[PDB]
Structure formats: C-alpha cells, structure tokens
C-alpha cells in the first residue's frame, strides 16, 4: 500500500531554435493551483524571473474531486504571480467553517479558465490529445498557438523559465537572475535527487500511505533527511556567523541557502515543502515527529526568510488554498472534511 | 451521556461497606476518566485494598474487552510497556494489551453491566468500580469514583500515611470545585468535543474554547510560579516544584484531573482532534512544566501512565477520524525529560 507518483508525459521544450514552440510574449499560459508545491514552484520562478507579463496565469479550485481540478465561470489577475487570487496576498488563513467544497467566490477560490471558457483541466488535457489516459495534474504550461500542453512536469518547467528563451521579453535585472548558476548546478542537482525522494516526494508517500509499515518507513525517512537539510544550514549559518559576526542579521541571511551563498532552485524546490509543513504535513500526512517551527532551527530561519523577505515567496503562498486543498480533498485521510485551524498562526514572523 | 451507576461506599451504607479483597477497579489506560481512578487509587495506598483489571486498548462495535495477584494489586494491574505498525487491532500480547477478567473470565465489559442490571440500555463505559459480594456496580462516574478513594471509607486499610493524604482539603473545597469545574467543560470534555465534532462549525468553536481554557490555566501557573521563584530563588527548582500546582500549594484532586487530559494532549490531541493551535510542549511552558513534574517525579502518575494504550485506542478506535488505523509516530518523544 504503498504512493506510486505517475511519471508526466507532456516534457517539451521553448526555445528561438524549437520547430513549434518558440518564444514569445502573450503566447504561453500557466495554469496551477495554490495548493499544489509542485505547481507552486513554477509560480516563484515565474516572479522571480519576471516572467508575469509575459507568461499568464489562472488558477483552479483548491477542492479537487473525482473529475480533476476545475475552475469557476482581468488583464492585472492574469499578470499576477498568483493569478490574482485575492488570499495569495494575506499572510496567514482564517476561519474554514463557512466554506463549503462547492464554494464560488470567483478570484477567491479559483479563477475561471479565460481562453476557452473550459470547467475542468481535464479539458485541457484532451485538446492537446484526445488520447490521454493519465492524471490530470497541475502545473499545465500551454501554448496558446497550437492548444497543446507544453510541459506538465514542474521540475522542467522551471528550468524552462529560468533559461534565456524569454530574455527579449523581460528587464535586464530579470535576465540577469540565474536560478542555476553553472558554478552550482551540479551541486544543485545533487541536493534536489535526495530532496525529491525524501521531502518533496517524502511527504505524500508517508501521507498518502495506506498500511502503517510503509507509513512509518517514510515518515523515518522524511526526518532523516530533514536532520540532513538542518546540518547544511547550521554549517552554513556558522561560517557566516564567523564571516560577519551574529550582529550583523541582514548580511547573514543575504548568503543563507541551501547551495552556495544565493538564491537558487535548490532553494525553491525545497521551499516549496517546508512552508506546507506545519500548515498542513503535519497534521494531515501524519509528518509529525516535530514541526519545522519546534524542532529545526536553522530550516526555520532559512524559510521565514524567504517568505518574509522575498516577495515571490510570500505573494505567490495562500495558507486558505493550502489547507483546505488537502483536508476538504483527501477523504481516505480525513473523511469528514474539517479543516484544522492550527498550528497558528501559518508562519511565524521573523523576530530577531 | 451522565453515568448510571450512582453509589457510594461507606461504614453506615446500607450495601457497600469498606473492606479489604471486596471491590475492584475496571480500567483501559487509554481513557483520561478511568486513568483519574488509577493515580487516586496510587496516591491514596489503595493498590492492595483494590484489585485492577484492564480492558484492551481496542474499542469496537461491541465495547471494551478483555483477554481470554501481583497483578491484580499493581497500580496499572500489571499491565507493562512492551513502532505500532506490527501491531494489529486484535493483538493478544497477555499483560501488555490488557488482562483478563479475573473473576468471571468475562471477555466483554458489557457482561458486568448486564450482571448488574439486566436491563441496562446505555454505554458500557470505564472506569467500573465493582462490588465482587452483590457483583454490582457500586459506581461508573470517575469524578464519584475519586471522591470515594479520597474519602475516609478505606482507611481502616491503609497505612497512617496515606490515609492522612486528603485530595480535596476542605480549605482548598471552594478553588478546587471552582477549578474543576471550568476545566471539565473546556478541557476534559473539550478535547473530546473538539475532536468528535462533524461539523466545522462546531469543531472551531469548540477548539478555540480548549485553548482559551489552557490559557486560563497557563496564567494561574505563571502567576504561582512567579511566587515561588521570589520565595526560594529561581536556582532551588526542587522547592519551587515541591508546591507547584494549580490549585493551592499541595497536590490535589485538581491536579490529577487536569492531568489525564495534559497527558494525553501532545501524543494525540493535537493530531488526533485537531487541537492543534500549539502543543503543550512548544505553546504553554508553565503548563508543560507542571506536567512534567507530575509525570517525572510521582510514581502514582508515572506508572500508571501508558502512551502506547493511550495512542493506539484513539487511533486504532476512531474510524470516522482516522478511517485506515495508522497510528502517527510523533510527536517525539512522548513526554519530554525535566
Ligand atoms: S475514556 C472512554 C469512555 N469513558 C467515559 O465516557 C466515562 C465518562 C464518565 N463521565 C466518567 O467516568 O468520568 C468510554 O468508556 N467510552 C465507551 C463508549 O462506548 O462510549
Ligand atoms: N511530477 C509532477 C507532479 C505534479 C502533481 O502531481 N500535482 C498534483 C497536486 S500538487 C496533482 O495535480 N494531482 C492531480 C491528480 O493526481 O489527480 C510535477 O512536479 O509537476
């Protein structure tokens, strides 16, 4: 009873030299939900990149039900790094009661799908092949010209975003940003191997587990190698410490991450998990040796940082999305549907 | 539901009357109610007086159950502390997930109720205080049951220390009953009725009434702690901790009451009813001190404290909660060192 993640087939590419998909503004399209860290790590790249103007954004229900992801029934949403959903915006949820899995506040529980009016992803997913058989997954990267889907695997679409493909079309401060310098990139993906299998993906295989053995290997497994990430970032925090000496907080967090001594997609894959985990994998995935918050220092400091500090990070996160796509969605792990309002408050400020 | 069985025990009552080798004590170490039972019958020197028996762990369709002398006069009737997931529901690990029944070799508490009352119609709940003469149940109320066990009824039996011990003093009666009394509502049922509500509505209200409550109970622990530390110097923790409690400066009845649910809140409260603002641990440090005290330097509470009855009934029992039956390993560790 173990969680056996589909492998996406939609993997292409953009570039000045691709036969079909080549770049362009106003061509390509993103859609996502809030909820989902997978889809939510192609929404900082897309702010960090600068990349909102020229790639639009909308947004299904946090609810996901037997049909898949749907959307309810306009230029500054689509050019926002949450597509303009109006929780994205606030820094922690609120009260769920009211709510119901049939809620319809248009820019508040999703977006409608603008170009063709379509009610589930589904459709998408049919238009760019009447013959699709797998999961109906967000992120979705399309392409307005041919009505395919481009790539629905986040791991790509952001190295898609972060590339020089859009570069005539954004600012020379955005072209400049590097989300995998080459001086890093190996060890970038080194630590994103052992980060997929035991956090990113080591969550929903212990939550989604459905016999307790294989539950209790991967929640071992999942604080394993948070002990592992902790130790980078204590070392790390040391040697800076040592470099500019603990009063000086500001010039200590500039170089605080996972790889080297700036920003990178080693940074935002794991962000990505680790803001979910007290709001939500804790209680609902059962991850809950500790929470961040409590029991890892050093991760905790690392994510409020980005979250406090980096706009992409706080203004492209919706607690509201986050948690009630999990408890109002998985019926097999909380059958009545009631979402729990703690930990409180979602993420804590940075008090120095 | 109010508890049926309404009795007491006494030299002039008409039925029940004290004696050593007559009544008996029918547990599950899971249940916060009948744990109140066990830690009053350790402090009060009832353990040989009082024989225990205690039901699995496991709550089906067809209530508690038990398995198919030392024991018997132990503060947890013997039952010792052996990952869950080799653990199966119907486990049988004899004196580990409950003992037998002793006298009748009943498989189900439901067969002392029905030897009692025929015709009984309710929930057969723990803990069962049990008269093996009339084999009756004197009393199924554990807020009744620990009056009982304080009072002077046993004394007779016990040695002149415990029966000097006095849980409910009455110069502490008015604080004590005053106490007790918010704290039922909003923390010893208010978990409960936290987590078995079906709708969210009343689940938040509910929930944000448990931890109004605990923060009533934080303060009046700060405040005394604040006390202490200016009478005996904040680096004599050992006299600070010696008068640390929430209703006067003795241990009381008032403890032991807030206690089962404080116990019981970090290894499954939070998860399990979603009592999850904060955890004692990391969210109330005068409560989470005053518990420590307790579990770590009083055998009555140590002893008779179970994590694995505690975390696998709820889990294992709450198919509307939990519908698959994993038992979450954290938080860790159960209780944290003092
Ligand atoms: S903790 C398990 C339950 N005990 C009680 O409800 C006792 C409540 C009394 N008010 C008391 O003694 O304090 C229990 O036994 N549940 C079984 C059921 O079927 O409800
Ligand atoms: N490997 C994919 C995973 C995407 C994914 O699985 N998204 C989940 C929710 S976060 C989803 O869309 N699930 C829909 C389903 O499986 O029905 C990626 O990284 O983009």
Same mark, same amino acid.
């Given at each position: 009873?173990?969680?056996?993640?589909?492998?996406?087939?939609?993997?292409?590419?953009?570039?000045?030299?691709?036969?079909?998909?080549?770049?362009?503004?106003?061509?390509?399209?993103?859609?996502?939900?809030?909820?989902?860290?997978?889809?939510?790590?192609?929404?900082?790249?897309?702010?960090?990149?600068?990349?909102?103007?020229?790639?639009?954004?909308?947004? %299904?229900?946090?609810?996901?039900?037997?049909?898949?992801?749907? !959307?309810?029934?306009?230029?500054?949403?689509?050019?926002?790094?949450?597509?303009?959903?109006?929780?994205?915006?606030?820094?922690?949820?609120?009260? !769920?009661?009211?709510?119901?899995?049939?809620?319809?506040?248009?820019? %508040?529980?999703?977006?409608?799908?603008?170009?063709? &009016?379509?009610?589930?992803?589904?459709?998408?997913?049919?238009?760019? #092949?009447?013959?699709?058989?797998?999961?109906?997954?967000?992120?979705?990267?399309?392409?307005?010209?041919?009505?395919?889907?481009?790539? /629905?695997?986040?791991?790509?679409? $952001?190295?898609?975003?972060?590339?020089?493909?859009?570069?005539?079309?954004?600012?020379?401060?955005?072209?400049?940003?590097?989300?995998?310098?080459?001086?890093?990139?190996?060890?970038?993906?080194?630590?994103?191997?052992?980060?997929?299998?035991?956090?990113?993906?080591?969550?929903?295989?212990?939550?989604?587990?459905?016999?307790?053995?294989?539950?209790?290997?991967?929640?071992? /497994?999942?604080?394993?190698?948070?002990?592992?990430?902790?130790?980078?970032?204590?070392?790390?925090?040391?040697?800076?410490?040592?470099?500019?000496?603990?009063? #000086?907080?500001?010039? $200590?967090?500039?170089?605080?991450?996972?790889?080297?001594?700036?920003?990178?997609?080693?940074?935002?894959?794991?962000?990505?998990?680790?803001?979910?985990? #007290?709001?939500?994998?804790?209680?609902?995935?059962?991850?809950?040796?500790?929470? $961040?918050?409590?029991?890892?220092? !050093? $991760?905790?400091?690392?994510?409020? /940082?980005?979250?406090?500090?980096?706009?992409?990070?706080?203004?492209?996160?919706?607690?509201?999305?986050?948690?009630?796509?999990?408890?109002?969605?998985?019926?097999?792990? /909380?059958?009545? &549907?009631?979402?729990?309002?703690?930990?409180?408050?979602?993420?804590?400020?940075?008090?120095?």
């Amino acid at each position: 009873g173990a969680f056996k993640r589909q492998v996406s087939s939609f993997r292409e590419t953009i570039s000045k030299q691709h036969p079909i998909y080549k770049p362009a503004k106003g061509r390509y399209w993103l859609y996502v939900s809030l909820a989902c860290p997978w889809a939510h790590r192609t929404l900082i790249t897309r702010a960090l990149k600068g990349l909102t103007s020229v790639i639009g954004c909308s947004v %299904v229900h946090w609810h996901l039900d037997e049909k898949g992801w749907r !959307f309810l029934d306009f230029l500054e949403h689509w050019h926002d790094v949450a597509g303009g959903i109006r929780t994205a915006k606030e820094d922690s949820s609120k009260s !769920f009661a009211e709510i119901k899995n049939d809620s319809q506040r248009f820019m %508040v529980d999703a977006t409608n799908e603008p170009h063709y &009016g379509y009610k589930r992803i589904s459709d998408l997913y049919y238009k760019s #092949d009447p013959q699709y058989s797998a999961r109906f997954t967000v992120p979705v990267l399309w392409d307005l010209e041919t009505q395919t889907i481009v790539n /629905n695997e986040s791991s790509e679409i $952001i190295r898609i975003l972060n590339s020089s493909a859009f570069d005539e079309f954004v600012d020379d401060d955005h072209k400049k940003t590097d989300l995998v310098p080459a001086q890093l990139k190996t060890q970038i993906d080194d630590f994103n191997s052992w980060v997929y299998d035991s956090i990113n993906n080591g969550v929903y295989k212990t939550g989604f587990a459905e016999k307790a053995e294989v539950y209790e290997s991967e929640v071992n /497994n999942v604080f394993e190698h948070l002990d592992k990430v902790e130790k980078i970032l204590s070392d790390k925090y040391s040697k800076l410490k040592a470099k500019y000496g603990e009063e #000086d907080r500001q010039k $200590i967090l500039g170089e605080f991450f996972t790889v080297g001594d700036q920003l990178t997609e080693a940074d935002i894959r794991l962000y990505t998990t680790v803001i979910r985990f #007290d709001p939500v994998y804790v209680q609902h995935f059962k991850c809950n040796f500790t929470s $961040i918050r409590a029991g890892y220092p !050093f $991760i905790h400091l690392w994510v409020r /940082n980005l979250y406090w500090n980096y706009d992409a990070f706080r203004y492209t996160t919706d607690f509201d999305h986050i948690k009630l796509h999990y408890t109002r969605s998985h019926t097999r792990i /909380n059958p009545l &549907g009631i979402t729990p309002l703690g930990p409180k408050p979602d993420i804590r400020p940075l008090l120095e």
